Design a protein around this ligand. Sequence first.
Ligand SMILES: Nc1ncnc2c1ncn2[C@@H]1O[C@H](COP(=O)(O)OP(=O)(O)O)[C@@H](O)[C@H]1O
Lengths: 311, 425, 78, 157
Amino acid sequence: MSVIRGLAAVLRQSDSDISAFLVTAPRKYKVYKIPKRTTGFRVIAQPAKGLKDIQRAFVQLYSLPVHDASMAYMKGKGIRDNAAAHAGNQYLLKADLEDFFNSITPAIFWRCIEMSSAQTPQFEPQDKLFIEKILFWQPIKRRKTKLILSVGAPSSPVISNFCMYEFDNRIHAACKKVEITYTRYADDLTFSSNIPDVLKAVPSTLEVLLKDLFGSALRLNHSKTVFSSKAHNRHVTGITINNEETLSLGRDRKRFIKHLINQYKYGLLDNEDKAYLIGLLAFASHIEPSFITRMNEKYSLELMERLRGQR
Amino acid sequence: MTKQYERKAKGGNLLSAFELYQRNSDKAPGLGEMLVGEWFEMCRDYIQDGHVDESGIFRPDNAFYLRRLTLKDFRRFSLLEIKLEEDLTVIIGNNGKGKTSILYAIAKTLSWFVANILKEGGSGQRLSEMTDIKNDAEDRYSDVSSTFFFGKGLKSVPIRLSRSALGTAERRDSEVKPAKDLADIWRVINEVNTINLPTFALYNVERSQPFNRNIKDNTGRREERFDAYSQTLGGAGRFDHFVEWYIYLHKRTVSDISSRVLTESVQKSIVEKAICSVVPSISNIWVEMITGSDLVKVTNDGHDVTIDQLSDGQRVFLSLVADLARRMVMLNPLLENPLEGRGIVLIDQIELHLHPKWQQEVILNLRSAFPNIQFIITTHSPIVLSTIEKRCIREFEPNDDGDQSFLDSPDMQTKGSENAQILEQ
Amino acid sequence: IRLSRSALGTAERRDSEVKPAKDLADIWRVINEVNTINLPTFALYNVERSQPFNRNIKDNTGRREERFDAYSQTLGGA
Amino acid sequence: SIVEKAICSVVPSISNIWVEMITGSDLVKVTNDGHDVTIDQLSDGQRVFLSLVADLARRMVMLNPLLENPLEGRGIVLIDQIELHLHPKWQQEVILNLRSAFPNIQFIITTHSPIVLSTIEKRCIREFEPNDDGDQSFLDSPDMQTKGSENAQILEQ
RNA sequence: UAGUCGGGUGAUUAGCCAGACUCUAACUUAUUGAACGUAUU
Ligand SMILES: Nc1ncnc2c1ncn2[C@@H]1O[C@H](COP(=O)(O)OP(=O)(O)O)[C@@H](O)[C@H]1O
């Protein structure tokens, strides 16, 4: 029985039990609200433990094609690589997608399966109903035909990465010929070039390609299409790009960290803010290693050693 | 959580500070306070802080204006983007190029700010599903995206107004939450401690209708502070409301004898000075109570005449200036000069009914009277453009079909240039 | 049922709670639509009741015979 | 057909006007620069001029049934601020179009623009002097030939 | 000139000092999930 047989082999459970579980599985989500950083809330639906294990086993079993321009949910690749792809460049065209994860329906996933340019696992027609139960979330209890991908599920990142394999391939192919580098952190397309007046023609290409591939289901967020250059602030997915073509945390965050270290110097920092500063300095060491050396010079090596890791 | 909000708020974030204030207030005898004295004080100081520059004009520390507008399948525009200036933006072009459409979209966006200032969760105006969607659009929906700036602590306030065409199964929602949040901040802070409120006004072609003093039982109370938001984006400023308010001020001043000085007299004097300074022909305005119906009289070219004997052009401009001055005075009680309050004012065809002599100074007078107001104006005249900087002008190409992405400034400096040159180029 | 109103500019909005009355009237309307039932009569007679007759009377035939015309202007005062 | 020809030949943007049945109801649609918007989608500049021309043409058509061209009929038409809501491009041809559509009508208009005056003969202009308190007893024509002159010259002199 | 970048000082998210940039043109975001860094291990 193909997919269910493999899931039983990996999960050490009977095929019948797994098949019985994957009947109301799209309804097996607990939805909760996480706070936004400024104001409001974000609705996240997280599957139950059993469905989570099923999704993890499924994604480990079947490897879908992903593009090298995708820097999100990839092993060995992350925020720093995405920012450093455009570290040496002058103009940039940060763009966004409109409700990316919730716009991926089973129809989109199955359509992208059959027209993929790369190798795709062969799925029997018997297990195509079970795949939808495994992967997709069913947000309205009365409507059973509304299935969407939910951010917060283990399977959703790789499914969303694969659903834009062809989009990434076509965009990269059409974009490298005009000397523009392209990346995507799974919802946030980044373009940059050293040639002026070439990025202004990119959003139309993105719109027409999205219409060609996903039809009306997936679309750009026209309010989130931002042009920038060295005359203005330049940041890619959280990392500020300096006018010296180097990655940085920004002046404001680096002064915030300096204030935190100065507070810790005089014992004005409690346990929670101390842990927050140790976490932020680990992140700063990852992104901008020279900041750690500069803080060692400014606040002495002994104080930093007492705060940061000792062993 | 609490600590992230505290870290953002102490860094200058207005939204986080307001969130902290509301939460801490909730616990009346618990953690927090009434003026949270940290969070409420920071919010009110953010809204109220400012300094007088070298020219004697009060400048708010965190200015409020509209940064960007995107129009998607709205009227004739497939996808248009504008980069309005902080102080003055002038949109020019041929007839039927979409300037009035842009002003209409901006007014529809500002109606949500006005509605949520007036009421909690109030609903503003919405795009029409019969005439606002582009006729030959394939998608059958329209978007009007905007971004507002309210200082470094609130750099982006995105609001999107959307409407699907009539008889379309799939409807499009509007993202109006950030405007509601900003107006909630304004209203809640104002309730606890009075603060200066922004002025949003639209002056369409719908103005310049005849004016007769037919407004007696007009239901609403013109002294009430929040009457300055009533019909303020309808297109025709309520000049009858101004007449009632002015007569009320005159009555309170003539019937009177913290410093035993009436603030109504100060408001009346400020409005009088504004009207006399902006309108060229009008030299002095007052209220006559003998011949015992109340009458407003102005001095036109040295002749005392009544308010309904003004010409079309001295009465329309007077109505605009008087309405704007009244709303600014009522919405800025803590300012030494209430006309220096902030806000967004849209004027359609500013040269309407005006002689070329008056067009040479309308923009300068308007900007001198209201220095912190962001004016977004359309015009059909080289004379008005000769008094306006090149960077403030957004021109439509003469061969546009609506598929232009970004409106631009002309390549020729218009300020101080001859009228023939501006006409030709 | 509560009919609430708040002044302009108040930090919190005061709204009505007309849901139970709406539920009772929904019961009335739905039951009547399925099978005819007797309906309540709400009327208000103010001082404006004393108005002169107008003799010649609009021949707006067609709406005075419908059953739900008994709710037309029934709380206007006259 | 007469009204259609009058409307299309005077309003620069209107190419064709016709009545279409939409959802049963009848509505009027016009052609603006190759697009087929309806009347209430017109701008304040095209709609006002269209209403003026259409009203005048309808009045002439009803009042002149014995003429092969009803627009060539007698009458007196007063227009206040003829250039209202009009771009300077349209002001260069607002007088010629009106006087070619309505040849026998005496037009008495007021204007605030020199672009309109550039298309009008000097003999047809009555000007109020800038220093006029109302005691003067004659409205006089300018002392420059405004027809065919520069914008700057008409604006200055 | 703005605006932006950020090396230093600063009981330090503020203020100041030096330096630099300018396609019409950043607006700093989201967990418990995924990956990254770090710590136990
Ligand atoms: N729904 C629509 N679809 C297509 N074109 C439209 C639509 N609504 C309006 N238009 C066009 O847009 C223009 C509207 O004019 P307007 O915005 O008032 O311009 P202006 O300020 O230059 O007078 C007209 O040319 C009209 O034909």
